[PDB]
Structures are given as structure tokens and as C-alpha cells.
Design an enzyme around this catalytic site. Sequence first.
Site, PDB file in Angstrom:
ATOM      1  N   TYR A   1       0.764  -1.259  -0.111  1.00  0.00           N
ATOM      2  CA  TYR A   1       0.059   0.125   0.140  1.00  0.00           C
ATOM      3  C   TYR A   1       0.761   1.043   0.041  1.00  0.00           C
ATOM      4  CZ  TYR A   1      -4.450  -2.743   0.876  1.00  0.00           C
ATOM      5  OH  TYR A   1      -5.441  -3.813   0.569  1.00  0.00           O
TER       6      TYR A   1
ATOM      7  N   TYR B   1     -11.580  -1.253  -1.540  1.00  0.00           N
ATOM      8  CA  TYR B   1     -11.831  -0.572  -0.072  1.00  0.00           C
ATOM      9  C   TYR B   1     -10.665  -0.054   0.351  1.00  0.00           C
ATOM     10  CZ  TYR B   1      -8.945  -3.427   3.182  1.00  0.00           C
ATOM     11  OH  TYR B   1      -8.270  -3.907   3.961  1.00  0.00           O
ATOM     12  N   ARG B   2      -9.679  -0.083  -0.336  1.00  0.00           N
ATOM     13  CA  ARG B   2      -8.088   0.157   0.324  1.00  0.00           C
ATOM     14  C   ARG B   2      -7.227   0.047  -0.959  1.00  0.00           C
ATOM     15  NH1 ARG B   2      -4.026  -1.159   5.569  1.00  0.00           N
ATOM     16  NH2 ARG B   2      -5.479  -2.816   5.351  1.00  0.00           N
TER      17      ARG B   2
HETATM   18  C1  LIG Z   1       2.111 -10.150   3.783  1.00  0.00           C
HETATM   19  C2  LIG Z   1       1.065  -8.956   4.199  1.00  0.00           C
HETATM   20  C3  LIG Z   1      -0.177  -9.499   4.788  1.00  0.00           C
HETATM   21  C4  LIG Z   1      -0.928  -8.353   5.336  1.00  0.00           C
HETATM   22  N1  LIG Z   1      -2.274  -8.849   5.874  1.00  0.00           N
HETATM   23  C5  LIG Z   1      -2.919  -7.858   6.114  1.00  0.00           C
HETATM   24  C6  LIG Z   1      -4.483  -8.478   6.802  1.00  0.00           C
HETATM   25  O1  LIG Z   1      -4.491  -9.500   7.091  1.00  0.00           O
HETATM   26  N2  LIG Z   1      -5.238  -7.423   7.107  1.00  0.00           N
HETATM   27  C7  LIG Z   1      -4.926  -5.859   7.097  1.00  0.00           C
HETATM   28  O2  LIG Z   1      -5.545  -5.153   7.408  1.00  0.00           O
HETATM   29  N3  LIG Z   1      -3.844  -5.627   6.503  1.00  0.00           N
HETATM   30  C8  LIG Z   1      -2.872  -6.454   6.154  1.00  0.00           C
HETATM   31  N4  LIG Z   1      -1.581  -6.196   5.478  1.00  0.00           N
HETATM   32  C9  LIG Z   1      -1.625  -4.725   5.009  1.00  0.00           C
HETATM   33  C10 LIG Z   1      -0.885  -3.857   5.922  1.00  0.00           C
HETATM   34  O3  LIG Z   1       0.733  -4.446   5.848  1.00  0.00           O
HETATM   35  C11 LIG Z   1      -1.436  -4.010   7.336  1.00  0.00           C
HETATM   36  O4  LIG Z   1      -2.583  -3.519   7.116  1.00  0.00           O
HETATM   37  C12 LIG Z   1      -0.515  -3.118   8.431  1.00  0.00           C
HETATM   38  O5  LIG Z   1      -1.149  -3.379   9.869  1.00  0.00           O
HETATM   39  C13 LIG Z   1      -0.544  -1.707   8.180  1.00  0.00           C
HETATM   40  O6  LIG Z   1       0.583  -0.935   8.393  1.00  0.00           O
HETATM   41  P1  LIG Z   1       0.788  -0.222   9.803  1.00  0.00           P
HETATM   42  O7  LIG Z   1      -0.056  -0.542  10.739  1.00  0.00           O
HETATM   43  O8  LIG Z   1       2.215  -0.636  10.318  1.00  0.00           O
HETATM   44  O9  LIG Z   1       0.672   1.005   9.453  1.00  0.00           O
HETATM   45  P2  LIG Z   1       1.238   2.365   8.811  1.00  0.00           P
HETATM   46  O10 LIG Z   1       1.925   2.420   7.608  1.00  0.00           O
HETATM   47  O11 LIG Z   1       1.584   3.185  10.008  1.00  0.00           O
HETATM   48  O12 LIG Z   1      -0.184   2.958   8.133  1.00  0.00           O
HETATM   49  C14 LIG Z   1      -1.203   3.822   8.381  1.00  0.00           C
HETATM   50  C15 LIG Z   1      -1.674   4.551   7.454  1.00  0.00           C
HETATM   51  O13 LIG Z   1      -3.006   5.123   7.939  1.00  0.00           O
HETATM   52  C16 LIG Z   1      -2.495   6.498   8.214  1.00  0.00           C
HETATM   53  N5  LIG Z   1      -2.158   6.422   9.566  1.00  0.00           N
HETATM   54  C17 LIG Z   1      -1.382   5.597  10.203  1.00  0.00           C
HETATM   55  N6  LIG Z   1      -0.992   6.120  11.471  1.00  0.00           N
HETATM   56  C18 LIG Z   1      -1.811   7.554  11.523  1.00  0.00           C
HETATM   57  C19 LIG Z   1      -1.923   8.225  12.694  1.00  0.00           C
HETATM   58  N7  LIG Z   1      -1.488   8.062  13.874  1.00  0.00           N
HETATM   59  N8  LIG Z   1      -2.597   9.545  12.315  1.00  0.00           N
HETATM   60  C20 LIG Z   1      -3.043   9.490  11.129  1.00  0.00           C
HETATM   61  N9  LIG Z   1      -3.275   8.761   9.977  1.00  0.00           N
HETATM   62  C21 LIG Z   1      -2.349   7.913  10.353  1.00  0.00           C
HETATM   63  C22 LIG Z   1      -1.840   7.194   7.054  1.00  0.00           C
HETATM   64  O14 LIG Z   1      -2.687   7.051   5.785  1.00  0.00           O
HETATM   65  C23 LIG Z   1      -0.708   5.784   6.990  1.00  0.00           C
HETATM   66  O15 LIG Z   1      -0.283   5.566   5.414  1.00  0.00           O
HETATM   67  C24 LIG Z   1      -1.011  -6.917   5.028  1.00  0.00           C
HETATM   68  C25 LIG Z   1       0.408  -6.713   4.438  1.00  0.00           C
HETATM   69  C26 LIG Z   1       1.349  -7.395   3.689  1.00  0.00           C
HETATM   70  C27 LIG Z   1       2.608  -7.025   3.174  1.00  0.00           C
END
Ligand SMILES: Cc1cc2nc3c(=O)[nH]c(=O)nc-3n(C[C@H](O)[C@H](O)[C@H](O)COP(=O)(O)OP(=O)(O)OC[C@H]3O[C@@H](n4cnc5c(N)ncnc54)[C@H](O)[C@@H]3O)c2cc1C
Lengths: 550, 550, 550
Positions: free
Chosen positions: A98, A493-494
Amino acid sequence: EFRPLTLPPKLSLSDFNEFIQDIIRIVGSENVEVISVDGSYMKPTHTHDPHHVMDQDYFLASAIVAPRNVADVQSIVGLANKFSFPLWPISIGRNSGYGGAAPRVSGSVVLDMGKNMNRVLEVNVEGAYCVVEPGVTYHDLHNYLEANNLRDKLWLDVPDLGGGSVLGNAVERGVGYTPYGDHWMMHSGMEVVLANGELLRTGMGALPDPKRPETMGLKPEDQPWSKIAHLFPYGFGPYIDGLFSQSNMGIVTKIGIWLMPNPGGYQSYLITLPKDGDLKQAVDIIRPLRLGMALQNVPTIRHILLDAAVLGDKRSYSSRTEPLSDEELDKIAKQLNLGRWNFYGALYGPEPIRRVLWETIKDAFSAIPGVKFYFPEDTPENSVLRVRDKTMQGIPTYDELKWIDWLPNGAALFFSPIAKVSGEDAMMQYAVTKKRCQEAGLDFIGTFTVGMREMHHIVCIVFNKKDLIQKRKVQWLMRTLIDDCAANGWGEYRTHLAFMDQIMETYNWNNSSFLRFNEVLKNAVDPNGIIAPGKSGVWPSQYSHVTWKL
Amino acid sequence: EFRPLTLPPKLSLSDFNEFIQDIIRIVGSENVEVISVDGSYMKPTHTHDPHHVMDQDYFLASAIVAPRNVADVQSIVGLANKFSFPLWPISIGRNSGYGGAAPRVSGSVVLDMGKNMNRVLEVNVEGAYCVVEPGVTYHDLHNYLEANNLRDKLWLDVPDLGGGSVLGNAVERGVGYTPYGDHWMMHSGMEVVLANGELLRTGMGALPDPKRPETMGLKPEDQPWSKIAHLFPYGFGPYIDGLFSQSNMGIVTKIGIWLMPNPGGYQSYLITLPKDGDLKQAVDIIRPLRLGMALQNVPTIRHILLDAAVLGDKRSYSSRTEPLSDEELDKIAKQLNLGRWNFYGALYGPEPIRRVLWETIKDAFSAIPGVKFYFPEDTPENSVLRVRDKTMQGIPTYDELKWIDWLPNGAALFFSPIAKVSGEDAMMQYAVTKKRCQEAGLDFIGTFTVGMREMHHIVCIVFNKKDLIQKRKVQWLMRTLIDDCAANGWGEYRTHLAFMDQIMETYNWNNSSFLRFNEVLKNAVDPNGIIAPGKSGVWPSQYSHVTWKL
Amino acid sequence: EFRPLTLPPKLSLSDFNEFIQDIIRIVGSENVEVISVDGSYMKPTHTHDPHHVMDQDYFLASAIVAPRNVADVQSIVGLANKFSFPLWPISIGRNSGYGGAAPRVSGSVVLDMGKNMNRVLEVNVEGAYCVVEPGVTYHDLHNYLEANNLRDKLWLDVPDLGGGSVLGNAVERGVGYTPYGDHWMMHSGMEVVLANGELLRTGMGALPDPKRPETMGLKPEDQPWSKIAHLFPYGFGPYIDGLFSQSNMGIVTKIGIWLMPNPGGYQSYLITLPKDGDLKQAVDIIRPLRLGMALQNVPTIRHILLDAAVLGDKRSYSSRTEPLSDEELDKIAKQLNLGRWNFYGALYGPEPIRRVLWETIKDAFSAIPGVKFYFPEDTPENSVLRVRDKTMQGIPTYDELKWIDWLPNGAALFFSPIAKVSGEDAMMQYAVTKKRCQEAGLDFIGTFTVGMREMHHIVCIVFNKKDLIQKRKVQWLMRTLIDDCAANGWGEYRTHLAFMDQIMETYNWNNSSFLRFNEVLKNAVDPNGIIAPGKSGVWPSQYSHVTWKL
Ligand SMILES: Cc1cc2nc3c(=O)[nH]c(=O)nc-3n(C[C@H](O)[C@H](O)[C@H](O)COP(=O)(O)OP(=O)(O)OC[C@H]3O[C@@H](n4cnc5c(N)ncnc54)[C@H](O)[C@@H]3O)c2cc1C
Ligand SMILES: Cc1cc2nc3c(=O)[nH]c(=O)nc-3n(C[C@H](O)[C@H](O)[C@H](O)COP(=O)(O)OP(=O)(O)OC[C@H]3O[C@@H](n4cnc5c(N)ncnc54)[C@H](O)[C@@H]3O)c2cc1C
Ligand SMILES: Cc1cc2nc3c(=O)[nH]c(=O)nc-3n(C[C@H](O)[C@H](O)[C@H](O)COP(=O)(O)OP(=O)(O)OC[C@H]3O[C@@H](n4cnc5c(N)ncnc54)[C@H](O)[C@@H]3O)c2cc1C
């Protein structure tokens, strides 16, 4: 630090330097980083997209800043407003597939909320909720429960990997696999820093905790919440919470997330569906079961290559550069003791209730010839079922990261449309997607995650990030899937940073009434346009659509 | 029509007359009403508050206007914007206890959406949802299901009375008693006319249905929705739906509401708790049961006088003008074969699962001495259990209206705080509320409705609307309860026109950040402040706080 | 006149009445018309679209106003600006297939320039140009030439029908069939009333005629032009003329159009191409011939049904409601002594030069088996060649109107994409278009008109305007053709009122830079947005895109 590779729009080098010196004074040289390496899932990059579909430096921060606390975020917003400097807030920055932690606007300051705003603020047993800061990953919250022995009273709800931020994921409307899998809907009570820098708390979080000697003189940020803050999300009046999910309307500093009580019984399972076409009848079978809660959690229907790629890269199954044939997919399925589609689910609660539901499930799935039923014990040590068995109880793992390694310099991009819970719609979506993957030279890899009345279809495009031609075919594939799916009445959705504009343009009923309404909201609350301009295709008025859209 | 009793702010008689002539030309003389009678629940009044706590004409429309369709609402919005005339949209206008159909600003046009915008737009079996216009009352939707025999596939979720609008109730975040009792959370896909008059559709409702010959040339209002519109609420980007509940952010013209499939088994039940003090242990018993889903629906804990008042007015139990003593409440309970508190719930699904949960519930409730258990068959013909047995299966009744007649010219005013699901918190809220009712000379009448981690405490103040002294005590009671409850950390979830400002002032954490943020949003989307100014305490910038707040 | 069916946006009935009384005082009751009938080509309607694809009253004037002269247009513009009333200028209003005289915005005043502003202002022999007002139809200008015997010195250039306005057609960039067929490129010197009401003259028309006693005291409108006004289009500085074609940038009151000197020799001809597939080789043959000027005029490649429809309605060739088969098209071609495609052209100039070019054309076309060659004398009395023999010499006829009557209540809608002059591109566009006509249940009817490096493909959709189902298929067909053609890299050159937005959205390179630039220009010159808002998709800032676009 003096000279960044990319400056944010309209800002001079001198202003960038004045600004950075101002922030260094606030947070310490150790928490500020000027960009003058894709890294890992292990220690995520915070400058750009590690799974880069566009050029590696296409989406790039000018600087990464780590606030120590909420006061630092208010000050940084004050400074971004003074200098008109766009902020890109992240929690953990593992949004792989993403865009990772990369900003939509190059030259933005990446606001690393996670490094210092890390705390598990409260685990409330009787209300069965937790309160967390952006830097609490799922793994961290798991360890917190274990350390205090809370594991026997409260379970977590985790996505496929455990390194994501509990808050970050929930504000993106991420999904997990227990009965509390709808992460955004398990929230109650959020703290937000507005673009004007003021602190807001939602719902009953706006009903202040009555004064008492012990909490007198606390900074707003540090004040406790009133009793119903993390119990009833609505509060009174307009329910503004959703304005903060998938938006640039504010910076989320704290959130309450409801947690499921240990159910007093748990049993995961795998149902193998032999044919590629068995998707249709399985989904028709799921439909009624999902609606009447025989299926409690978010069960998933995985495609054989998603499980195969967890078990070993493509070179371990074939030395073919082109996409595996149908015949080769049946061979891989046979070799792994899986079907062409694999349905993963779980039963919760007392044995007597599990027993009856499990008989209902088994019985309905038996209408499909060749169906086989397994519990974790019945499968090999390395099985996906044994990993998901942890997953559907809220235990974080990292095993599923390995399907990203399907190709040599594997990078992931997610195409995530929603489908109805009907065999007909599911087959149609699959067929449309499969066809374009083939035209692009890529294997179809995907999972359907089953919501109550919809399925999230996670198509996993994996490509070699050091192959220019294939990166270009991926961009062509993505943009065409977007359009074909819209022409078949399905929206995503995303999405990833590069496709935000094209996906918002798909939600254009009545001449884009939804985006215009969102712009109006954004320009009112953020007159200098400093909070993540372009997030979700929503651009403040200072960003010309001509210059900035993709 | 020429001369209204009250004109909206700053508008001349000449402009009122031009405006009304303009509307009459749009909708027909039969659909416009100039106010130059409290009526009934049967044929609600649309000019003022029928359960008037303030003077009867205190909250009064200048005129009532009934749009024939969505084009008429857009044209009326256009005229309201041209003349700066405030609109007060209602669906059915049975918001009794919360102001009925009365506008917050006197002189407003009351927009009766329900009279002509009446249609059950769609009942989808496979997706188990319905799509409705403002005029669809619950009774109406029940008869639609019966007429097409849908009763055996899909159930409704109804509040205590059947005449409410399915949409009106949901946008107020109303509550019903089946597993789909959280009405606002069962919605997916809404159509709204904005204050600028443009049409918006939320979520996946913004992803347009793909063109096809059959739907070409339809007005926006009349176009169908894409496949996932009423299946997945979120759509893409900012989730703005909550901006339209308990707000003045727009005029809701359509909504989809998810409907429960016939569960294949149902059994309602009554658990009588003998002592006034048994509330505490009951609630502590409820807590874990609600959280682990032994309690499926929204069960309710009714206070003996609420059931008594359904069965007969106060005069039929005592000829005392003062509030019934504790001893008289025990006598009434004994006479009716009820406890001092009466727990009403229901079991759904196959007999084998109902059996197990019913043994778990019975067992837990047995720790309270004197507890008795009843099924509808076990109680008398006129019992509340027999009425609620229909209610917990989504069948509309009107039996509960009778408690309003507790006093001679009985009117209702609801005091609706939220409580934790804990005996200690419940007893404390009850004690606080009971004491003030007593100081006011009123009987305590109330129900606790059990949400997952919260309870909605509906205190039912009943007063004689032709008694000036008591009307005044009622206003004193309300305003004091509001303050007492806030001082103990509880806020109300919904209120009447006259207390909206004082309840929003309670949600003042960090110097009223929540209300300021809401005002910013309202003034951006409604620059002429024509949509229900003052709804939930949210005033557009043209309404001085000094002049308008209560 | 008192009450119109539809009022323009935001205007009250009282203001409409003040306005109309103001105009009646300026132009006379005989020249104003309030709309409180499709008519004919003979006496065109000026209130709506006579060939209505949408509902008949969908695009409707509130009133029709006929200025007597340029002073009246300036005064009407002044009043439209005072009341913010949109004007829809027409010259003759025969834009059949493109909306007739209907305004894009309903409630507009339709400004009939043609009824009184009718004059052939000048026919200059030495400069071989004419100067005309909006009311000069081609027939009118033909009769003027005949009356003064100018026929032997100067020829006209006419489109398929003779009733169109010479100016109206040219400002739409219309096409005729002699060497001066590019009508917009034959113009030089225009007079325009701007939206601010000021008079402008373009090019050398801005270099004033030197004063002289005889012209002193003339109103600007009535002053003569300087010598080079109608001889050299460019003038000095920015060449703004093109801002006035297909735009809402102003109201054209006069124009000069260059006229061809009698060539001193003329011979028209028909080349019949037997097979449907012969389009490809024909076009490849045309290519070099057009570019080297063996083909002098704008030759056309007509599809057999276009000639058949001129000769008789569909009922006269088959009693089939579905589209004619391939086999039936061959039978029709055989019956008429035509090919499946029929190439119509003409030779100009001395016999010795015509001879040589005719041998070059004949020779090149001989590479297609079965080609036959005819001169008018060689064909029957009712032949299309005999009609076009007049057309390619600038003589007006009305014979071609009959193909509109292909179906019972035949109405026309034109789909007008451009194609490369290459068999491959032509076949591809035809195939795309043919397939969609078939899905829609319509016969493919069309002509290719040959520009130097491009072809205008006039697909003539004919439908029964009293058939609701087919009207809807027509809208589906159009909208789909638009998208298909854009996806194959072809845009349309001109369109109907209902497709203007979707066609401008197709011209979205670099995030719609072209439309944004046009909007900037329009809002500067028309701050009240009164001149034909929405023309070509270009909306002034007071017209929300959400409310107004289709
Ligand atoms: C192999 C793989 C599997 C995955 N499986 C899943 C799954 O089962 N379910 C799922 O949901 N996702 C999945 N993901 C997608 C993503 O990797 C995860 O959703 C992950 O939890 C999102 O990264 P992060 O939560 O560390 O957040 P971040 O990169 O921190 O992303 C948060 C994003 O939301 C906003 N954001 C974050 N924090 C804030 C804040 N404090 N204030 C305002 N805006 C904010 C910004 O838009 C930002 O870009 C997967 C990814 C991979 C690579
Ligand atoms: C005896 C009794 C028992 C009750 N029991 C319950 C109960 O169990 N549960 C419960 O929830 N309620 C209950 N109610 C409260 C109320 O009577 C019902 O909720 C009822 O359904 C609300 O009225 P209505 O739906 O007819 O709506 P309306 O009066 O039409 O009210 C809707 C309100 O929401 C807004 N609104 C309505 N339609 C629109 C629209 N189209 N666009 C924008 N805003 C709009 C306005 O603010 C308006 O005032 C009870 C009331 C009484 C008197
Ligand atoms: C059977 C048939 C055949 C046709 N064949 C041809 C053909 O071969 N070639 C061709 O080009 N067209 C053709 N047409 C299309 C159209 O009918 C003609 O082009 C016709 O000349 C246009 O109408 P009008 O000139 O009477 O103009 P009007 O309807 O008067 O239209 C002019 C349009 O241009 C603008 N306009 C007109 N006058 C003014 C003014 N004074 N100021 C500002 N804007 C103005 C407005 O947008 C207006 O709607 C054909 C139509 C039919 C039905």
C-alpha cells in the site's frame, strides 16, 4: 540537516532549514532525519515505498520526524502551518503493498508517531477493551497481555502479520480473522490532533472525566478518559469518527479497541476444495452460514498459490518465467494436500456449541465432491493451518510474509475489490482478475476474506522490483483491473499511493458528489492543506488536480 | 397562505409569502401547510411538541411542507437557500419524549418527508437487507414482508412502538431488541440531499451501477445502486456516514438497513428479580453473559413501574398524588407477579444451541434469591412478556404507549444517560436519578437496555402537560439530572429539543473541542445555515449563541 | 407573458416577469415568446429538441427572444447580466441530431438571431468573400447569388441540407463538400457581442475603416469593415477567433466567409465498391490521392443504407424490426446499382486538368475488383449522385433529409468521431461502431467525409422518438460508443446537448488540463455565466458540476 533530495511544494531551501532547526530544537537531533534503502519488514523504511511499483524515489520524504509525545505533534503541526509544510503521519509504516511509509506528496515530512508514542495505555478487563498509541504493534500488545497473564481473560484480533500498528491498521479499516475482525468497528474513543493543532477526543471521550485531586493540572493529552469513553462509541451529536479513517482529516494519537473475552473454547479448521470451479458452490454455501453465525469469525478462502508461496518461492515449484498452468496448479495442490481453493475458519465457545456448529458446517460443505476436513493436528508441521490456528485466536506470526518472496525481488501490490457473498459474483470477479493477470505475465495469487454480507478480495500481485518491464506491466494491470472492476460494479476498499486518485474517481456517482463533499470538509478543517494532501485522492485547494493527480 | 403565527429569523412577511407561493407551485397546495392541536400517536402533529415540557407553541413551525419526491427536496433546499429559510426535516415525526416533529428554531418550515416519500424501495433476500424512504414506518415494512411472505426468510428489528420510521429512528441512533438492535450499525448506503442541494450517496453507494439500456436517462435520485451499496458500508476514503446521524449535515432521503435472516428458532423469556437492590447483582451477572454472547439480542431490565404503567394508569394502583413508596412498589410487583426489576431477553437459533445458552443464563441468574423464570405461555394474556415476545422477533406492537398515560394528561420526556455494564455503576446512576425524581414529586420509571459494553438507561419522566407547576419541576429535574450525571462521568446519548444545548455543553473536554470542530464542519457545508440549525446544539454562524441557546 | 413551464436557475417568477416585460419593451411583443411541438425542418422548433433522445421537454426554453438588431442583443445581454438569466443563442436552430435549437440549461431564453438578423451584408467579387448575419441560410445565400447573377463568378459550399445558417454552421466547425468544405477555415472577420455586452470584431476587423463623410455617426454594429477584414483572418496579436467556435465565449452577429470562384469546369462522380470489406483498400487508395490533390473537394464514402434511406424508409425494403442482415444489404445494393460503400467526389477546373486527375483516380480505384464508375447522366433520376452533383457545386437541396425517416417516428442523433485516413483505422472504427449498433437493435448507417489527413465519421443513429425502450437503447449506444472510441484513441468533433459533458471528459489528457484552461477563460469573460452555460461541457463557476453535468 542542510539539503534534502526533494523539497515539498513552494518551500525554499532556507525555509526548510529554518523549519528543521525548529523541529530539532523541539524533538532532539536523534528524532529528526533528513533525506539528503528498502530495508525490511523487520526494520521498515520510513522514507519511501519498499515495494516500489513506481521508481524507488518517486514517493519520498524530505525528512522523517519522530515526536516524543502529543505536545511535539501539536508543535510540529504549528510549524507545518507556519511554513506550509505537508506532514505524512505514519504509526508503524509497514503498509507494504500500500506504499509502506512513503508520503503521497514528495518532500513531505514523514511523521513517525510510532518510535516514541509507543505505549499500551490501558487494558481494562471488565470493559474488555484496550487503549493504545500508534507505536503499539500487535506483537507488542500480545506481549503485554502475556506479561500480565491477560491471555486467559482477553484475546487480540490480528491481521496476517503481527508487526502492524493496532491503531494504524484500525484507522485504515484493516481486517483480522476472529469474531472481532472488523477492526474499525471495534474502536471506541479516539484522540486526534487537528490540522489547526487542537486536541480532539471523540464520542464519550468528549465527556470529560470529573475532576479529582490526583488528575489536577494534567496536560489534555495526559488526562484520563471518562468511564464510558471506550465502551460506547457514539457519544452525543454527529458521529464524526469515520471522518478520521482513510482520511487526511487529522493525526490519530490514541484509540480504544474492544477486545474479545477468552471464549472458553476454540477449534480452527481447514476445508479443502478440489476444483478451481468449487469457489462458486463454496461461496453459495458460506452465504447462509455467515449470516446465521455458524461462521463466527472472518473465514478466508485462499487460492492454492497463496499457500504455496507461503511454503516456497516460485523457483521451488517450477523454473518457468511465465504463469503456472492450470495443470501445474493441480500438481502443486496435490503435492501440498490442499485443494485449488482452501477455506480456513474457526469455532469459538463451549464444546457443546462448537460441536453443533461444526456438524452444520461439515454437512453443508459435503455437497461439494472430494471435500476434505482437517484440524491443525492433522496437517504437517509447516502447514498454513497451524499458522492460521494462531491467527484465528489473536496470536501474531510472521510466517505469511514469505509469499512476497514468490518472485526474485518480490514486491507486493494489493488489488482489493469487494464482492458479494455469492458464487456467481465471486467467480465473475475472479475470472475478470485472472484474465488480466495472465495478459500481464503474472500468476494469480489471492484470498477472499468473508465479511457478513461482503467479501474483501485481496488479489496479491507480486512482481520483481528490479525488473523495469514487469513494474510497467504491473502498473498497467492495476489500472485496468480498477476500470474493469468498476465496469462490473465493484469498487476497492483500500489502495496504494499511486492508485488513490484513480480509485476515488471510480466513486463518482452523481458527478463525483462524494469527493466534492470530502474536499469541502478538508478545506474547512485544514486551510493550509498540511495534513497528508492527496490521501485517498482528497486534495486541499492549494494542490492543483492538474499537477498532482495520478 | 398569508400569515403564520411565527416567522423564522430575519425573514419578512413578504418574503415568507413569496417563498410559500413558490413552494405551492412546486408541490401542490395539498402538500404545503401554513400555521396561522397535540393530536395523537395515531396521527402525529407536525407543528409542535405534542409532549410539551415548554409552552405548547414554544417550538413551532411557520409551515409544514411535504415534498413529493427528491426533486422537490432539492428545489425546496434551493428556495430555502435563496431566502435563508431554515428547514426542519422529519421522517414520521413521532419523536415523542424528544420533541415530536417540532423544529428547534421556531418559524422553520417542517419538512414532512414521510407523507409522500414512503416507499419500501427494495427487499434483497440473498443480501438480507432492505432499502427504505423516510415514510416507511416499521409497521409498514412489517406488512410489506407479510404481503410477499418474506416473514419466513427475513426478520425486522423494532423499537418499543411500531409507528416510527425505520430511517428516522436509525439516523437518531435508536435501539431495538433483537441481535440487530443497534440500528445505526445495521445501515449501509445512504442517499442525502446536501444543504447546497446536491445529491450524495455514501459508501459503495458512491460506486455507480454500470450503465445499461434499462436504466439510461434516470434522474440521479431514481438510479439503482451498485451491487455492494447495501452490503459493505465503508466504501473508500473517509467514512462520512456518521456525519449524518444526530446532525444537521443533510437531509436523508434513502437508506439501506441490514435485516436478520429468520434464525430457525426463537424463545423469549422473563426473569423476575424480587428486590430493588437486585439490580446490582443482575447487572454483574449480565456483564459476562452479554460479552460472550449467551445474551444475543439487546435484553432489557425494566423497573416495575414501567410494566405497571403499561398495564394501567397510576389512578388504578393508588389515589396518591405523591410518588409511590417502596412498600407500594413491592405490593404492585406482587399483584402483577413481577419483581422490582424484570429482565426481558430472547434466545435465537436451533433448539440444541438455545438449550445450552438457556441453561447457562438460568444458572447464572439463580445466584439471586427468589428469581423466577417465565416463557410467554406461563404469563397472563395482558402481560408485557407477551408483547415483548413479539418485539424481540421484530413484530411491531403499540401496547407500550400506555405508560405515557401514567398521569392524567401524560406527556413523556426522556432522560437517556449511558451506564457501564456493572452493578456498582448501575446502582449509582439509578440512585442519583431516583433521588432527583423524588425531589421533583415524580415516580421513578425506567428501563436499562443492554448494549455489549454499555447500557442505555431510559429514564421515562411522565408529567401532566396541563400542570404548569409540574412542567416546571420537570424542566428543573432534567437540567439537574444532566449536571449530576455529568459530574459522575455519564453523558446522554440522545435528547429533546430543549436540552440539546445543555447536553452538548457537557461534552466539553479540552474547552469544547468537539463542538468547535462540529461547527467548522457545519458552516462549511451549510453557508446559509438552513438545515435544522441548533440540532444537537450545533449552530451555524448566523445564529448567535447568546440569542439561541437554551 | 406570465408563467413559463421551466424557470432558469435561481430566478423567481417575479424577476422572470420583470425581465420579460423589459424585453418586450425592447423588441416588441411579436419578437419575444413565453413557453407556458416538434414542428419541422421546414419551420424548426425553437423551444426544445425535435429529435429528442431524452424526454421531449428535457431541454426546454423558458422563452424565445428575437432581437431586431445588434443593439437589441447588447440590451438583452445587459438584462441577462442584471438578472443572471442564461441566454442560448441560435442562428437558424436546425442543429437536428445535435439538439435542434434546445438550450443546454432548461429555463434559458433561446435567442433567435436569425428571424430578424437575416441580411446578406456583402458579396465581394474581387475578394471572393461574402459577409453574413445569422439568419442567412445557405438557400438564402444561393438565391442572393442567383438574383444578382453571381452564380457565374462565385460558388457556395454547402453541407448536406440547404436550410442551415452559413454562420451557425461555420461556428460549429461544420463541413461541406467542395474544395472550400472546411467552413470554419473559410472565415475571416467576425463580429461578436461579448458577455459583458461589448462589441468585438476579430482579426483585421479590429483595424477600423478610415473615417469618411458617408460613414460618420454610424453605430459600431453598422460601420463598414476595413479593406483586409475579410481577406486575411489573422490580424495582429493573439488569434482569438477559435475561442468563438463550439464555445459559449460570445454571441456571433456577423461573419465573412470566403467563396470559391467558378472553377471553369466541374464533373461529379460515383465509384461503387462492391464489398463491405472494400472500405479498407478504398481508404488506403484515398490517402495519397487526398494528400496530393487529385481529390480536390471533401469526397465522401457513404454506407449503402445511407443512400437506401434517402430513397425510401426501412419498411420499403424489409418488414423486419431487427437490423438488416449482411445478405439483405447486398440485395439492397444490387437493387439500387450501388456497392456496399459508395464513393462520391468531384473534379474542378479546365477539362485538360480534370481529364488527367480523373485518369489518376479511375486507375487507383481499379485495383478493387468489381469497381464501377458513374457520372450523373449514367444513373437514374432519383439517384443520390444527381443530388450530390448539385451539392458538390454548392447548390442547396433537401433530398437527404429523407434518411431521417428510416424508422416510423424517425429522429436522428449523430455520433461523430474522427478516423485516420487509413483502411486499417477505418475498418477498426466501423467494426467497433457496427458491433454496438447491433447490440442496440439498430441498423448501422454512416458516412465517412474525407478531410486531408483525417476523416469525419458521421454515424447516423436513427430511432423512433415515440419508442421509450429504443430511446433508452440509443442513449446506451451513444455513451458506450463514446467510451469505446476513446479507448481506441478517437474523439468526437461535435455532439448533441446530452453528451457534451461525457465527450469533453474524454479530452482529459494531463488531468483535464484542457477543460480547466477553458473554464478559466470562460469565468473571466463571463462573470455572471449568462452565455450558454454548459455548451461543450464548459460550465461557468455558478453552475455546480454535481448538479449540472450529464
Ligand atoms: C503479507 C502482508 C499481509 C497483510 N495482511 C493484512 C491483513 O490480514 N489485514 C490487514 O488489514 N492488512 C494487511 N496487510 C496490510 C498492511 O501491511 C497492514 O494492514 C498493516 O497493519 C498496516 O501498516 P501499519 O499498521 O504498520 O501502519 P502504517 O504505515 O503506519 O499505516 C497507517 C496509514 O494510515 C494513516 N495513519 C497511520 N497512523 C496514523 C496516525 N497516527 N494518524 C493519522 N493517519 C495515520 C496513514 O494514511 C498511513 O499511511 C498486509 C500486508 C502484507 C505485506
Ligand atoms: C412510548 C415510547 C417508546 C419509545 N421506545 C423507543 C425505543 O425502544 N427505542 C428507540 O430508539 N426509540 C424509542 N422511542 C423514541 C422515538 O419515539 C422513536 O425512536 C421513534 O422511532 C422516533 O420518531 P420517528 O422515527 O417517527 O421519527 P422522526 O420524528 O421523524 O424523527 C427523526 C429525527 O431525526 C432527524 N431526522 C428524521 N428524518 C430525517 C431525514 N430524512 N433527514 C435528516 N434528519 C432526519 C431529525 O432530527 C428528526 O427530529 C420511544 C418513544 C415513545 C413515546
Ligand atoms: C439530415 C442532416 C444532414 C446534415 N448534414 C450535415 C452536413 O453535411 N454537414 C454539417 O456540417 N452538418 C450537417 N448537419 C448538422 C446540422 O443540421 C447542420 O450543420 C446545420 O447547418 C446546423 O444548424 P443551423 O446551422 O441552423 O444552426 P443553429 O442550430 O443555429 O446552431 C448553431 C449552434 O452553434 C452555436 N451558435 C449558432 N449561432 C450562433 C451565434 N450567432 N452565436 C453564438 N453561437 C451560435 C450554438 O451552440 C448553436 O446551438 C446535418 C443535419 C441533418 C439533420
